[PDB]
Amino acid sequence: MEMEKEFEQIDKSGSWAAIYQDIRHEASDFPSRVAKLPKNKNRNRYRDVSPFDHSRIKLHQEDNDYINASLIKMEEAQRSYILTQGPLPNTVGHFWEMVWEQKSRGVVMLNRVMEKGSLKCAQYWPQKEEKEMIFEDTNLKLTLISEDIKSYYTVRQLELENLTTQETREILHFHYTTWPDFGVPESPASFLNFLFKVRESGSLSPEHGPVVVHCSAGIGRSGTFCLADTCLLLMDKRKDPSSVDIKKVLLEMRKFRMGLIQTADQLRFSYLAVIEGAKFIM
Ligand SMILES: N#Cc1ccc(CCO)cc1
Incomplete structure (x- = not known):
């Protein structure tokens, strides 16, 4: 069926939970043996969210190459994304090692450091120009260059330096700051505006490594971001956008990382975002 009228048909019939459970039943199951090794327990935020072995990002390190991160490669759309958990106190250096090694231009953050009164990820970037961060375990230096605070999101320019080689690169940090503590946004308008700002920066384009996108677990809000982007791109490329x-x-993306889209409300919100976004594109 088409999207907008399939949408109204699920709303009128109140069957979002049944549609979502079908997806969960059909989703791929692949091994995640490296994630479950005992030496990696403090590298995982949640025991039930792990990268598959076949698609995990490897750190360029011979001691321990593990990080909770997956490469989502969308062949027809010609987009790639790295989806990862919010960094932990003992993985902030691994996180920036990955950004460096994979040649990413942008980092997309969809959570606040504290939500619901609890910590959802480490404070992994510097908040003042004159107070830079050094990650001694991976030999990287990170400096805040500039910050632009808007009503729904903040964009930061960061400098990442590989202290072994003295090479430097400019990384863009796109921080969506207004996703509610419970539920999903009422309108997709500010999320779409944010997606378009990431696109306009070059961070999603083939001349760079894959964008790094995270929330707390790296499957819910993060899944919404890449699903909406990929669907809108396919609607531009194809002769028949209603196909x-x-x-x-979503099932294709779940071949590369488990659990993408965590609730039936997130599924409905993804439909809404693609539907509204397809009208603005033209
Ligand atoms: N890119 C891309 C892409 C991903 C999934 C699908 C659905 C396959 O039946 C089609 C295209």
Whole structure:
């Protein structure tokens, strides 16, 4: 079926939970043996969210190459994304090692450091120009260059220096700051505006490594971001945009990382964002 009218048909019939459970039943199951090794317990935020072995990002290190991060490669759309958990106190250096080694231009953050009164990820970037951060375990230096605070999101320019080689690179930090503590946003308008700002920066384009996108677990809000982007790109590329099937795209993405889209409300919100975004594109 088309999307917008399939949407109204699920709303009127109140069957979002049944649609979402079908997705969960059909989703791929692949091994995640490296994630479950005992030496990696303090590298995982949640015991039930792990990268598959076949698609995990490897650190360029011979001691321990593990990070909770996955490469999502979308062949027809010609987009790649790295989805990862919010960094932990003992993985902030690994996080920036990955950004460096994979040649990423942008980092997309969809959570606040504290939500619901608890910590959802480490404070992994510097908050003042004159107070830089050094990660001694991976030999990297990180400096805040500039910051632009808007009503729904903040953009930061950061300098990442490889202290072994003295090479430097400019990284863009796109921070969506207004996702509610419970539920999903009422309108997709500010999320779409944010997606378009990431796109306009070059961070999603083939001349750079894959964008790094995270929330707390790296599957819920993060899944929404890449699902919406990929569906809108396919609607631009194809002769028949109504042939884009959002449930099939999501199942394809779940071949590369488990659990993408965590609730039926997140699924409905993804539909809403693609539907509204397709009208603005033209
Ligand atoms: N890119 C891309 C892409 C991903 C999924 C699908 C659905 C396959 O039946 C089609 C295209």
